[PDB]
Amino acid sequence: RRTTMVISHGTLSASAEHAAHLRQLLVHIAQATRQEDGCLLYLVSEDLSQPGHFLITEHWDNLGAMHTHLALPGVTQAIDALKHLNVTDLKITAYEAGEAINIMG
Amino acid sequence: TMVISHGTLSASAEHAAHLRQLLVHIAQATRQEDGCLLYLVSEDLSQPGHFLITEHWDNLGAMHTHLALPGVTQAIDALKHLNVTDLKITAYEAGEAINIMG
């Protein structure tokens, strides 16, 4: 249950004008990013309670891996692609996970 | 600072819509509970019919109280009725927030 894993939780929304494009963009971003060093999970999803509101769920092996992702080129570029779709509410917060606890399954 | 739970599950095509409805209902209920900071149910854009449960709890105890609720047992039963067999939930004790955007 000891872990160095880092969790990132991101949310964003788009209007109906841009959301289809956003869905595709998020899928593209996920496909690429999952192949980065230490990326254990990069899931893009849509809130079942709130159409047009999206989640970006990431698990990184350790802080260093997440840092590499944040520091290597392409982050600003992806953010700008989101801004191009008039996304103004991107929030991303990460956390070091101190223990990993199986609840079920 | 908090406990983060990450859950994944899927249902057959026949059952997916009802699953979506059940998840929405579970979230509506759970968000009202003591210590629930966040409870979001979402669908993987890359894989339709695959769902995520994202929960933030104030502490492990609050999560454990939730998990022990009879209503939560009934919800897990309702998942089984839809032939969900792959529910996997992992919880993590989270450190302090690292603000990346917003």
Tokens describing residue B56: 């933030």
Number of structural domains chain A divides into: 1
Q: Burial level of A88, CB count in 10 A (0-12/13-18/19+)?
A: exposed
Distance CA A101, CA B3 (A): 10
Cross-chain Cβ contact A93/B100 below 8 Å: yes
Experimental determination approach used: X-ray
Report resolution (Å) to 1 decimal: 1.5
Q: Which CATH number belongs to the domain containing residue B93 in this structure? A: 3.30.70.100
How many CB atoms within 10 Å of residue A81?
A: 16
A75 touches chain B (CB under 8 A): no
Q: Do A27 and B45 touch (CB under 8 A)?
A: yes
The parent domain of residue A46 ranges over 1-105
List of residues 6+ apart from B62 with CB closer than 8 A: B3, B33, B34, B35, B36
**Any residues with CB less than 8 A from the CB of B79 and at least 6 apart, and which?**
B9, B19, B22, B87
Pick from A76, A90, A96, A48: nearest CA to B54: A48
